[PDB]
Design a protein around this nucleic acid. Structure first.
Lengths: 249, 46, 137, 183, 164
RNA sequence: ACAAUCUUCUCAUGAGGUGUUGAACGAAAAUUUAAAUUUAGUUUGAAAUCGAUUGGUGAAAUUUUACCACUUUGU
């Protein structure tokens, strides 16, 4: 309704569940990893002035990061105070390691050391005040292997805020803005059913049209639904994209 | 492998007892006024 | 007499064409110098080839600058034999990589004005391509 | 001779300076612009080889072509922006009336006929600044302290001070203390 | 004259560049002076005299009996032998003991330079046993340099009678 | 002279924070405009032996820019 005064949802997302299921065709270590759902968006005009190395906190109701995924928290000095707060909040099983910024800069200097730290956790969360430093220190070994630290605001440093922020951080999808006209957003996996997947799509679309696309949903060229190896089924096409680009330019 | 199979003494995993001997000796003479404390060392200098 | 060529590897970030020229000229003059850079962005490949007018000057430099502890990197200097030197492998000598900013040039053409005829050409067979995708599905 | 590690260190400083100028110019075009002082003293701390072309041009405009050169400038938006660009290589502070008089009496030298000549006599000052209503060293010092209309002309006539032997950036009233250590 | 290989090896010392980089790491781990040790202990004395738990210290290991015991225990990561010990037989076995125990070792110049690190007039041998996590890469790079600039170099030269 | 200023947060409630080693392997999609940017992912020693792309733009006094990048080379 917001995008084009129409809602061609539900039917396409539900059909995609059967489309990937039909395309199904001893090991010791097993995991519940599922193929992600890639929501492709095309915009009429470029949406990024420059490479922004922070994710978008797209709040969602169906988390794309399972609660079994380990988390690593990066805080400002000293690390002992925030280590005590994490333990007192009951996040020991979630926030496994808390690394102070000075310790992260010093004790992890080699590329192999940075890669070992990167592979030791599934998601990285960072204090909002220390996020601008992580472009350095962490380097290309983090920002290209799908490991972008999350800007979690823990400024006041209290247990309830930590629990709310982590739950909010886990229950959200992220997308790193890049200068282009096309991008993909993680909407979920096959584990999430059709109705939950549809809810994730519309919530992301509202967030995208609000704080990502400068002119809103009117500037959306086309949108498609895709998986790792599935066909990019066209979710929706702008009925007036061709004339809008001609008139704008 | 290391040449010596002798067990590791506990002294290498605990705070030094030689320094603790001196700390108690220094703390004693601080009470007796034999050694000037750091705060009163500065006052005497100026 | 014979123009010796030296290969320098594991260059620390910052030991670039200007820095190598003023340094290696102390041992002996250098007239051409080239360091490999990536096609896409021109970032240094941390390895380079430096020639010398005389093979003897190249040989002595390789002796004193092999396994040099520079910035935590063991600089490697080996003299390349002539049979493995190629004629076209020293083009763009000391050439400031004209790093074309493809991101902005894409934006400029993206933001470049497009007329109705240009938009019609831009549309082309997009509907047909969408129909072809629908037919495939 | 020069070691290889020296050239990389110079390069790293050059790349370090390039980013810093990129910070100050783009998206951070705001200067502190200290108030309560119409005149400030700026001394070039140090410079390195192969310095950025923009920094050298700012130094040439500010007459800081040599290290340990002290020049008095008027507080302005353009001056503050130039000071921010050359902040790493220049230290700024608020001079005092006593410090300014002492500097003029000790190391006060003007530019007469294109040559740096000490203002040991008031006859030269009167002849050089006849149209500026300046005839003695005290009059020039008072005009500089008050930052008058002829202060810019007096500053151009006066050669830069050589306060040879410090922190980087704004120093405030502590810069006047360094003047006592130089004169 | 003609010298045996075990004494000839001490004329081939570490190069100036690698030695200068070695002492940059060593100077981070100097033992605290007699004055600094007294200041630290008296500071803890006042906290005891009035009224009131640390980490393990970090420093470079020195002493001939101490270092040889650390090599035999395989506790030493890097052993730096002085090149001019007045009785040479004091350290004439150290390169062989370091080879047997797999300890990266180097022969550096000016035993006085070694002593300056430890606030002593003279040291026959220095040994780095275990450093802070910040300097793991710096020590690792030095050990690789010592392998190439000292062990890979010479080696065939250290088995030949020198002099003559 | 292996030393130097990469943000350990601001503004205003939202908007910002411009910064990443190289090489190799490897998807399948989208718009731009095959070439181009996005783009599932991965492997690694601050690893390396031709493959430099080679356009735009300025700024000193055409050679000079080691990112000058279109917002595009000395105040």
């Amino acid at each position: 309704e917001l995008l084009g005064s129409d809602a061609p949802l539900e039917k396409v997302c539900s059909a995609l569940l059967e489309y990937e299921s039909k395309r199904k065709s001893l090991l010791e270590d097993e995991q519940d990893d599922i193929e992600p759902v890639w929501l492709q968006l095309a915009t009429l005009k470029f949406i990024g002035n420059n490479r922004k190395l922070i994710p978008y906190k797209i709040a969602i109701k169906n988390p794309v990061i399972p609660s079994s995924s380990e988390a690593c928290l990066i805080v400002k000095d000293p690390q002992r105070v925030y280590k005590d707060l994490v333990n007192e909040a009951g996040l020991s099983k979630v926030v496994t390691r808390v690394i102070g910024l000075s310790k992260l800069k010093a004790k992890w200097n080699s590329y192999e050391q940075k890669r070992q730290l990167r592979d030791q956790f599934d998601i990285f969360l960072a204090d909002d005040r220390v996020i601008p430093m992580l472009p350095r220190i962490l380097g290309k070994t983090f920002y290209q292997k799908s490991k972008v630290p999350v800007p979690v605001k823990i400024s006041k440093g209290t247990a309830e805020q930590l629990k709310r922020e982590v739950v909010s951080a886990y229950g959200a999808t992220y997308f790193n803005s890049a200068p282009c006209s096309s991008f993909m957003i993680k909407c979920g996996h096959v584990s999430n059913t059709s109705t939950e997947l549809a809810e994730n799509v519309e919530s992301i679309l509202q967030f995208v049209s609000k704080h990502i696309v400068p002119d809103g949903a009117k500037g959306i060229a086309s949108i498609h639904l895709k998986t790792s190896q599935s066909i990019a089924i066209p979710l929706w096409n702008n009925p007036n994209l061709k004339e809008l680009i001609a008139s704008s330019r | 492998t290391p040449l010596s199979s002798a067990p590791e003494p506990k002294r290498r995993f605990a705070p030094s007892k030689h320094e603790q001997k001196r700390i108690l000796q220094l703390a004693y003479a601080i009470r007796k006024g034999r050694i000037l404390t750091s705060e009163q060392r500065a006052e005497r200098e100026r | 007499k014979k123009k010796g060529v030296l290969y320098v590897g594991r260059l620390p970030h910052g030991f670039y064409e200007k820095q190598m020229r003023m340094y290696f000229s102390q041992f002996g003059p250098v007239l051409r110098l080239r360091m490999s850079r990536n096609r896409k962005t021109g970032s240094s490949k941390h390895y380079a080839f430096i020639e010398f007018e005389s093979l003897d000057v190249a040989n002595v430099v390789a002796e004193t600058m092999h396994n040099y502890l520079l910035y935590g990197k063991l600089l490697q200097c080996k003299v390349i034999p002539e049979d493995q030197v190629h004629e076209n492998m020293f083009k763009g000598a000391d050439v400031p990589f004209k790093r074309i900013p493809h991101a902005t040039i894409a934006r400029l053409q993206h933001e470049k004005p497009l007329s109705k005829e240009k938009a019609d050409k831009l549309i082309t067979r997009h509907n047909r391509k969408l129909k072809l995708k629908k037919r495939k599905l | 001779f020069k070691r290889a590690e020296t050239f990389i260190n110079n390069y790293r400083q050059r790349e370090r300076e390039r980013i810093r100028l990129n910070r100050s110019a783009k998206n951070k075009g705001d200067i502190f612009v200290p108030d309560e002082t119409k005149l400030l003293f700026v001394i070039r701390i140090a410079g390195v080889k192969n310095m950025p072309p923009k920094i050298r041009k700012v130094l040439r405009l500010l007459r800081l072509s040599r290290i340990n050169n002290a020049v008095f400038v008027r507080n302005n938006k353009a001056v503050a922006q130039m000071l921010r660009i050359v902040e790493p290589y220049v230290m700024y502070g608020i001079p005092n009336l006593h410090s300014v008089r002492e500097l003029i009496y000790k190391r006060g030298f003007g530019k007469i006929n294109g040559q740096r000549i000490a203002l040991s006599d008031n006859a030269l000052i009167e002849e050089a600044l006849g149209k500026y209503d300046v005839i003695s060293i005290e009059d020039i010092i008072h005009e500089i302290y008050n930052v008058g209309s002829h202060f810019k002309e007096v500053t151009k006539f006066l050669w830069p001070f050589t306060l040879t032997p410090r922190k980087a950036g704004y120093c405030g009233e502590e810069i006047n203390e360094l003047i006592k250590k130089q004169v | 004259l003609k010298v045996p290989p075990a004494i000839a090896q001490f004329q081939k010392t570490l190069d100036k560049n690698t030695a200068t980089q070695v002492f940059k790491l060593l100077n981070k781990y100097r033992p605290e002076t007699a004055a600094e040790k007294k200041q630290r202990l008296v500071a803890e004395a006042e906290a005891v005299a009035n009224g009131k738990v640390s980490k393990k210290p970090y420093n470079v290991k020195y002493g001939l009996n101490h270092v040889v015991a650390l090599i035999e225990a395989k506790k030493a990561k890097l052993v730096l032998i002085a090149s001019d010990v007045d009785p040479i037989e004091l350290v004439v076995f150290l390169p062989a003991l370091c080879k047997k125990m797999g300890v990266p070792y180097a022969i550096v110049k000016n035993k006085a330079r070694l002593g300056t690190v430890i606030h002593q007039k003279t040291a026959a041998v220095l040994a780095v046993t275990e450093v802070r996590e910040e300097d793991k890469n710096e020590l690792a790079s030095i050990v690789s340099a010592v392998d190439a600039n000292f062990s890979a170099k010479y080696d065939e030269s250290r088995r030949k009678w020198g002099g003559g």
